[PDB]
Ligand binder design. Structure first.
Ligand SMILES: [Mg+2]
Ligand SMILES: [Mg+2]
Ligand SMILES: [Mg+2]
Ligand SMILES: [Mg+2]
Ligand SMILES: [Mg+2]
Ligand SMILES: [Mg+2]
Ligand SMILES: [Mg+2]
Ligand SMILES: [Mg+2]
Lengths: 42, 110, 141, 262, 185, 131
RNA sequence: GGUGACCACGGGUGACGGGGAAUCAGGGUUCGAUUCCGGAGAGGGAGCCUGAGAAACGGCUACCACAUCCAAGGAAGGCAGCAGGCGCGCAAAUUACCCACUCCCGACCCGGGGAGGUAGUGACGAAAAAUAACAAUACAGGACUCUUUCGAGGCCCUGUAAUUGGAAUGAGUCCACUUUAAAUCCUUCCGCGAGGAUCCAUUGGAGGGCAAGUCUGGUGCCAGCAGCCGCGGUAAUUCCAGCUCCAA
């Protein structure tokens, strides 16, 4: 083996870590579809 | 109207539904000036920039939270030059960007 | 033209099967040479043991090193080369581990710029590779 | 198989028994008797599924073992005894005296007959032969062997025997214009009058029957049971009188009935 | 060996092309305007209509006065009339071919509860049914996809045990009243 | 108990088992499922008999409350009820108290008896040594 | 003598046959080890006894291959029955309760049945169906109008709200009935049980095919993506992430 596989995982290690943001939960089921209908039609 | 629509839906139907214009998509940069006016207009020939007071407000609010232009721009998902142009009285104001700055620094800019 | 006679069913049917041997898919499915040649033996997945970690150079015009492993299957102990897909997933696989191996998408055909590789690694020793990549689980140490 | 079978799966049971699906794996498996397996009705399903005097097989078994169920005048305690066509079931503690005859859907109907009618039955001659010392015999559609019959009686005629003696009382010949019931096939349970019998040597004879409404139909000679002299039946016909209604007119009759009572 | 049945079938079918703009818009209009939960309910309704239309087409290809055509056409027409999606004047298979799923979606229990004034706002009509406040004639039904027949249409009402018919107010009102009277005299 | 009604449909007297069998409807609009004891004493008042010849079973209540449906038999006398009736229903209100052991124990006892031959003392004392 | 280009004979089958199953214009192409019917077999071959019925394997004899106990002289074996174990593998459940049901067997109303039934495990798969509804104040967005955008609201929607006000309900916890052979589950019903109702919906995607960003930070023909066309060499609509959208 040529030994060229030395830099596996490079960019995913260099990438600065940014934490997720706390956002309020999404509706699910009929309410999500209702909210989706209300913002695409009159 | 909600009252008339729910009144019509409990009886003989005459309601009309129609799709919105920009419905079901995310336009990342919303346009600030109506192009119907901007294509029509031939006479008026000037754009008002941001006032120096607005740039001072952004400067003081940002500096009072340990925050730089790079960090504020990254926080509101814009390039650093548009922040540096808002603070220096050079950039044409955009209400959407201004609102993002207000929620970033907690002040009122309009 | 073709024969249209009322009593020509034998001619039509014999001609059709003699000519059915002339398309690639029917012959591949019905001859048995392809079933004997492929290492999985008609299975969808297989288990094997990693022999070494290799990098294959991508085909032109692309330019990269695609991180693979050399795997020897437990049954019928042929040796295959399997892709290890994601940004850092090669570092999870240690030598002499025992992986599961799936097809790579095109039914025994090479995919992408990776030359001659038909397999990808799913589930290096039994914890799945996606859970390892996403941090859901960790190596059983 | 190395020998005779003793079980019967539930979906392999005869269709006219009207057994359902979810209540078991097995079916009652009628014992050997004077009737064929596909053309009989064992006592367990007659007593449990049709009359509902019982809810399980144990209840059937104990009301049989109390030794009042009589088939053709003899007490039968075997709960899978094949009852079969034109056979008289007498309870004579409650006093019912049923008779087993097909309805027009090909299913064994509950048919109550009078105590005076329960003395006799109709049997169909299937064989006549001369036994040792030159005495003639006949074999019915049951396993009954009658010795010394009338010399005018031939095969596939019917005879009226009375129970508890086994003697022949009367008979009618298989002749054109006599009342018959179809005892097998597509027209099972229908009643009509024989109009024609055309013979096919080697093969089966087909008999053409015309019912009361003029609907003519044909069937094999083995599925013909003559039941009356010309037009009058010698037994009591069940409800519907062997006239098969089409699905449309049966729907109309059902709608009229539910409108009258609803 | 076992007394099971194993008989079952699917009640819907997925569309052939995903991400068709017009189809997505139409079934979203149906979902929003009838208060459905997912696309699967739209697909179930149009599968039902498609099977009816297949039966009607096959009968229409047959000859008039054929006994099977008469029998099954009359049964199908009677069924569609008794569930209210077809009028009594229109008693031919052509009018069966003229039906739309907005006719079937109107006959649901949820739509009937909203349109009877028994609950405002069709989404409130769904949650009112699912919380066991509604009864067809005397049977308490919590099934929003109950298909209301014409005969059992005048008998939709609040159930006798809910706190919109008879008494016994719910646990929230009882809790608030008892904490109020524990805090007071 | 003030508002509980009993209705009987599909009634039949069969003298074959010396009993009267029938389907029972119970209406309990606000209460829980009615216990079988007061069902059978209500039936005792209803058919002018004692609640010793009355056996009720299979009571399933409908969705949403209210109606309940089950079956019952009314016997002519208690000797018949002990004569022809399943022993678990005699046990349910105690007239037949069985004490049987586990069927594993019976089967192992049976195989052990099968292993020793003939002599009454050994074939009986086979369940005396390995205890 | 018999058979054969109207395909005998021979070979293969990852071949038990069929009723049927998937697909779905009409034609057709695949599948059927698998609960019903028919066949065949009981580690492999062979030979028998008894009986109405077997060339039986929860019968016997022999050889072959495995294999158990032994004081070494001998003796005993057959899970492709129900559980359970090892092995094989990508690949599959409890060494549970009962004859109450369905039926079978017996000298038999009474005994027996891992046939069968019941519960356990079970996202193979199929059906139904929660994760909020209603009301009001703020804030921005949208076709509005009262003068023409400026100020409104007599207006109308739509929103992200850890801004309320008080109603409704299960999911759970759980007394009792009911269920049942005895239980369990469902069903019925006391008593508790919701305001970030934190009682928290997820898998895949956002260049085109194909619904959805040229937003921002990082990397710099590397790492990686990409079914296919393709993307990446210091301003990446495609990689790695955050935010926001799309589909089910
Ligand atoms: Mg030509
Ligand atoms: Mg084979
Ligand atoms: Mg098969
Ligand atoms: Mg079989
Ligand atoms: Mg054999
Ligand atoms: Mg043998
Ligand atoms: Mg949840
Ligand atoms: Mg992205």
């Amino acid at each position: 083996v040529h030994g060229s596989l030395a830099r596996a995982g490079k960019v995913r290690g260099q990438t600065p870590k940014v934490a997720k943001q706390e956002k309020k939960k999404k509706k699910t089921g009929r309410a999500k579809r209702r909210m989706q209908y209300n913002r695409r039609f009159v | 109207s909600k009252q008339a629509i729910l009144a019509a839906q409990r009886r003989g139907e005459d309601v009309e539904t129609s799709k919105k214009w920009a419905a079901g998509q995310n336009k990342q940069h919303s346009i600030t000036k109506n192009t119907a006016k901007l294509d029509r207009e031939t006479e008026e020939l000037h754009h008002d920039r941001v006032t120096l007071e607005v740039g001072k407000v952004i400067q003081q609010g940002r500096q009072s939270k340990g925050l730089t232009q790079k960090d504020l721009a990254t926080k509101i998902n814009e390039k650093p030059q548009v922040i540096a142009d808002y603070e220096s009285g050079r950039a044409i104001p955009n209400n959407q960007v201004l609102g993002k700055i207000e929620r970033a620094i907690g002040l009122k800019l309009r | 033209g073709k024969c249209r006679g009322l009593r020509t069913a034998r001619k039509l049917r014999s001609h059709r099967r003699d000519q059915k041997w002339h398309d690639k898919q029917y012959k591949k499915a019905h001859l048995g040479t392809a079933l004997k040649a492929n290492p999985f033996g008609g299975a969808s997945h297989a288990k094997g043991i990693v022999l070494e970690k290799v990098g294959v150079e991508a085909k032109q015009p692309n330019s990269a090193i695609r991180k693979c492993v050399r795997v020897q299957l437990i049954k019928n102990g042929k040796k295959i080369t399997a892709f290890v897909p994601n940004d850092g997933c090669l570092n999870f696989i240690e030598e002499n581990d025992e992986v599961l191996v799936a097809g790579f998408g095109r039914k025994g055909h090479a995919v992408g710029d990776i030359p001659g590789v038909r397999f990808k690694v799913v589930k290096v020793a039994n914890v799945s590779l996606l859970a390892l990549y996403k941090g859901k689980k960790e190596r059983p140490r | 198989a190395r020998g005779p079978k003793k079980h019967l799966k539930r979906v392999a049971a005869p269709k006219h028994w009207m057994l359902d699906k979810l209540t078991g794996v097995f079916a009652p498996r009628p014992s050997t008797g004077p009737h064929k397996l596909r053309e009989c009705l064992p006592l367990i399903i007659f007593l449990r599924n049709r009359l509902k005097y019982a809810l399980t097989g144990d209840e059937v078994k104990k009301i049989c073992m109390q030794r009042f169920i009589k088939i053709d005048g003899k007490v039968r305690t075997d709960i899978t005894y094949p009852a079969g066509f034109m056979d008289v079931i007498s309870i004579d503690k409650t006093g019912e005296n049923f008779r087993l005859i097909y309805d027009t859907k090909g299913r064994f109907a509950v048919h109550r007959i009078t105590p005076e009618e329960a003395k006799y039955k109709l049997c169909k001659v299937r064989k006549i032969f001369v036994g040792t010392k030159g005495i003639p015999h006949l074999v019915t559609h049951d396993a009954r062997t009658i010795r010394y019959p009338d010399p005018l009686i031939k095969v596939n005629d019917t005879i009226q025997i009375d129970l508890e003696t086994g003697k022949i009382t009367d008979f009618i010949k298989f002749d054109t214009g006599n009342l018959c019931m179809v005892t097998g096939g597509a027209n099972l349970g229908r009643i009509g009058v024989i109009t024609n019998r055309e013979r096919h040597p080697g093969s089966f004879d087909v008999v053409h029957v015309k019912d009361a409404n003029g609907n003519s139909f044909a069937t094999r000679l083995s599925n013909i049971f003559v039941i009356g002299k010309g037009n009058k039946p010698w037994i009591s016909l069940p409800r519907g009188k062997g006239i098969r209604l089409t699905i449309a007119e049966e729907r109309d009759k059902r709608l009229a009935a539910k409108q009258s009572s609803g | 060996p076992v007394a099971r049945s194993w008989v079952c079938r699917k009640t819907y079918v997925t569309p052939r092309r995903p991400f068709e703009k017009s189809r997505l818009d139409q079934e979203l209009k149906l979902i929003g305007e009838y208060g459905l939960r997912n696309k699967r309910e739209v697909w179930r309704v149009k599968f039902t209509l498609a099977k009816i239309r297949k039966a009607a087409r096959e009968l229409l290809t047959l000859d008039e006065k054929d006994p099977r055509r008469l029998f099954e056409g009359n049964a199908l027409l009677r069924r569609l009339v008794r569930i209210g999606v077809l009028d009594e004047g229109k008693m031919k298979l052509d009018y069966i071919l003229g039906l739309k799923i907005e006719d079937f979606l109107e006959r649901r229990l949820q739509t009937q509860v909203f349109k009877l004034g028994l609950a405002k706002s069709i989404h409130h009509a769904r949650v009112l049914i699912r919380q066991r406040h509604i009864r067809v004639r005397k049977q308490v039904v919590n099934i929003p996809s109950f298909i209301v027949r014409l005969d059992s249409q005048k008998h939709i009402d609040f159930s006798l045990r809910s706190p919109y018919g008879g008494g016994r107010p719910g646990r929230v009102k009882r809790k608030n009243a008892k904490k109020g009277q524990g805090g007071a005299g | 108990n003030d508002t509980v009604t009993i209705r009987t449909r599909k009634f039949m007297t069969n003298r074959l088992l010396q009993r009267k069998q029938m389907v029972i409807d119970v209406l309990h609009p606000g209460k829980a499922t009615v216990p079988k004891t007061e069902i059978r004493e209500k039936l005792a008042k209803m058919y002018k008999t004692t609640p010793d010849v009355i056996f009720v079973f299979g009571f399933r209540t409908h969705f949403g409350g209210g109606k309940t449906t089950g079956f019952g038999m009314i016997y002519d006398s208690l000797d018949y009820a002990k004569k022809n009736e399943p022993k678990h229903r005699l046990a349910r209100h105690g007239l037949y108290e069985k004490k049987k052991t586990s069927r594993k124990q019976r089967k192992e006892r049976k195989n052990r008896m099968k292993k020793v031959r003939g002599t009454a003392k050994a074939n009986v004392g086979a369940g005396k040594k390995p205890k």
